[PDB]
Amino acid sequence: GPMELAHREYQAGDFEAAERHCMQLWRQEPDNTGVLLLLSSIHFQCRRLDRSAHFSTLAIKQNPLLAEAYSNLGNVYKERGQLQEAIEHYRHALRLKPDFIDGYINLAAALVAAGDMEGAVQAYVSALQYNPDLYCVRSDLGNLLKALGRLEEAKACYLKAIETQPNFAVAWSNLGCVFNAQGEIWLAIHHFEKAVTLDPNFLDAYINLGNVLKEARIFDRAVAAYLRALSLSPNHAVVHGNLACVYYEQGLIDLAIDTYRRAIELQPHFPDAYCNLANALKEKGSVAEAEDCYNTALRLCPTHADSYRKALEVFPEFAAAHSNLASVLQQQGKLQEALMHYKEAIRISPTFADAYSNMGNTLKEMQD
Amino acid sequence: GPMELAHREYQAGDFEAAERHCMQLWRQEPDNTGVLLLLSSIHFQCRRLDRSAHFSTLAIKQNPLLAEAYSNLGNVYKERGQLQEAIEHYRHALRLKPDFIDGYINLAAALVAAGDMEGAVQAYVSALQYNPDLYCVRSDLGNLLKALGRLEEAKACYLKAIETQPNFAVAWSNLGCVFNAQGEIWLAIHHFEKAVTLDPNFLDAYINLGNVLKEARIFDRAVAAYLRALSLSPNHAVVHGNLACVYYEQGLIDLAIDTYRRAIELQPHFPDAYCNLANALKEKGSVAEAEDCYNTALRLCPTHADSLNNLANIKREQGNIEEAVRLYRKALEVFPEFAAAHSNLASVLQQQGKLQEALMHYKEAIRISPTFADAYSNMGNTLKEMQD
Ligand SMILES: [Ca+2]
């Protein structure tokens, strides 16, 4: 019947001819469930949820064993942010039909949105069980795993996804991030480079690639990548602050001062960006306009806590503070404890002169 | 009901002891296949090719179905250099005993050592069907596979041998060389890194690591390597001649100068090293000496294209164009795929107004390295001068 025309207009995005043909039909065969189904679906592609859940309900009132109809209702519920009800409907529709892949996917979605990470992954495994070719779902699953700390399991979904669809940059980039978190630098670089080689316009691939080469200390390469990132997104505030950093390490204290600032303009929040500029100013030869920058950053927030025990409680292994705190504790009869603090400070920062110099005195004030 | 107190001591590495017990064991029981075989293994171990193969002959006269008997006998033939003799003994020993692993292995060596490579490949394969956990035997397969081009296969092997033995250092490095040869700079280095994290004295590991960091132009690191590699092998010439280039690359022209001279010491016949020392001199101004090294380099290797092409440059800069062209032409004869030489000449021609004959070489040097920016600029100019 017009089911042909309907399915046509609907395929052609021409949602109005669709809805027309449908009502026509429905008014002749009030039982055509696939129609009340199509309708529901249509009013959904038109943000018209109420009319969507309405026809979904008509479908059920004509046949309570339609897995799809409870899915559709589940979809109208998820958007209205009504997660419990979305889930409740997805689970039923899956009871009526255990091989309904779309339901498993919708449900995973609502589940994660609702907090249940474990359920979500159980749904993806089911989904993948029935259709191991959905490489995107593999990936999404891999993400949830990574999100939960199961990197090796994540590493597997990604590899499997790549295996299922060799040409799929997202995968490699995600797989590259797993390796990075694992300290497997050369591997991260390899995947990122591969991600990028696959989709040149892959912004984040370029940012991540630059970040690893940065950490690896391979600056020229680290740069070439950051630049290529900025060309794809001239406004990325963080990239600047990082690119600048590679410039300051490379030995261009000037361009750092230049680029560090511009970064701030992009987002006057970057605290690290200010203090980094302060240290860059000290080298340039301007201690005065360096300290203000230090304050500026410092003033913006107590986040870093540089502004002792509390700063220590915040910053683990902050040699500087371990030295400061130790001095006071030492010039207070509590040398024995300061000694342990300096010791720790010197264990943190091998080249902390004042620390060996302070401890030598503390250990000498213990003999007296 | 035999007297086996003889094999106990034998196993300890106490040949004579065994030999003594044995001798008497046969004296009473002149059919000690086990004694004769043990005897032959001993002698062979201690380089007694003649005695070794003698007891073995006996153990065969007695029990002819002794695989290990023919294998030991063949081992001696191989050692002597007689591969045909040794190959049939290994084959027979296998007909008799199919599950005879040392039989397959020993076969592989001799086969490779002879010529058949796919044959020695089979031996390795079967020997692995009987005991898949013999990893050191997996590598050797890959190595053999690699040298045969099939890298994807050899890769499978190294990949597996590591699965079997994760701490199998040589495994890594070797797999590393497959990625490098495949242009997988990042993997190739990643592996070469395990190869050394695991075994910190793995020379070839370092020499391989830096050799690749270098062609990726990651010179600081590539120096940490060769430095290491050289700490393990103080007089390794080739490693000097490569460290030198990494220096020259980072500006330190004087170090490279010394270094290249060191590497030449540890290897008089070292063209490439000369032809590079020259390059170094040529840039420090010492263009006289520079011309001398390229002279030597072309003395040692009358066909050294880079020495050819680079000496022509020095000649073009002395007005010596005709000659500069003879050299540019000799270097293109020794290597028709020489992008550089192709434009270098295409420049001397363009400077003489021989534009058409200059396009010819600029086209041919671009088709040989589509990334040649310089040859693109020049050919751009010539085409213009032909249109004004
Ligand atoms: Ca003209």
Curated annotation (Swiss-Prot), chain A:
Modified how: Ubiquitinated by the SCF(FBXO31) complex, leading to its proteasomal degradation. Glycosylated via autocatalysis; O-GlcNAcylation at Ser-357 promotes nuclear localization.
Effect recorded for residue 357 to A: Reduced autoglycosylation. Reduced localization to the nucleus
Domain topic, free-text comment: The TPR repeat domain is required for substrate binding and oligomerization.
Highest rank taxon of the organism: Eukaryota
Residues with attached carbohydrate: 357
Result when mutating residue 186 to E: Abolishes homodimerization of the TPR domain. Slightly reduced enzyme activity
TPR repeat coordinates: 4-32, 67-100, 101-134, 135-168, 169-202, 203-236, 237-270, 271-304, 319-352
Entry protein name: UDP-N-acetylglucosamine--peptide N-acetylglucosaminyltransferase 110 kDa subunit
Subcellular location: Nucleus; Cytoplasm
Assembly with partners or alone: Monomer; may exist in different oligomerization states in cells. Homotrimer, oligomerizes via TPR repeats 6 and 7. Trimerization is not necessary for activity in vitro, however it increases affinity for UDP-GlcNAc. Component of a THAP1/THAP3-HCFC1-OGT complex. Component of the NSL complex at least composed of MOF/KAT8, KANSL1, KANSL2, KANSL3, MCRS1, PHF20, OGT1/OGT, WDR5 and HCFC1. Found in a complex with KIF5B, RHOT1, RHOT2 and TRAK1. Found in a complex composed of at least SINHCAF, SIN3A, HDAC1, SAP30, RBBP4, OGT and TET1. (Microbial infection) Interacts with human T-cell leukemia virus 1/HTLV-1 protein Tax; this interaction increases Tax interacting partner CREB1 O-GlcNAcylation.
Tissue expr: Highly expressed in pancreas and to a lesser extent in skeletal muscle, heart, brain and placenta. Present in trace amounts in lung and liver.
Annotated disorder: Regulation of OGT activity and altered O-GlcNAcylations are implicated in diabetes and Alzheimer disease. O-GlcNAcylation of AKT1 affects insulin signaling and, possibly diabetes. Reduced O-GlcNAcylations and resulting increased phosphorylations of MAPT/TAU are observed in Alzheimer disease (AD) brain cerebrum. Intellectual developmental disorder, X-linked 106: A form of intellectual disability, a disorder characterized by significantly below average general intellectual functioning associated with impairments in adaptive behavior and manifested during the developmental period. Intellectual deficiency is the only primary symptom of non-syndromic X-linked forms, while syndromic forms present with associated physical, neurological and/or psychiatric manifestations.
Naturally occurring in which organism (per UniProt): Homo sapiens
Entry function: Catalyzes the transfer of a single N-acetylglucosamine from UDP-GlcNAc to a serine or threonine residue in cytoplasmic and nuclear proteins resulting in their modification with a beta-linked N-acetylglucosamine (O-GlcNAc). Glycosylates a large and diverse number of proteins including histone H2B, AKT1, AMPK, ATG4B, CAPRIN1, EZH2, FNIP1, GSDMD, KRT7, LMNA, LMNB1, LMNB2, RPTOR, HOXA1, PFKL, KMT2E/MLL5, MAPT/TAU, TET2, RBL2, RET, NOD2 and HCFC1. Can regulate their cellular processes via cross-talk between glycosylation and phosphorylation or by affecting proteolytic processing.
Family indicated by similarity: Belongs to the glycosyltransferase 41 family. O-GlcNAc transferase subfamily.
Consequence of substituting residue 297 to T: In XLID106; uncertain significance
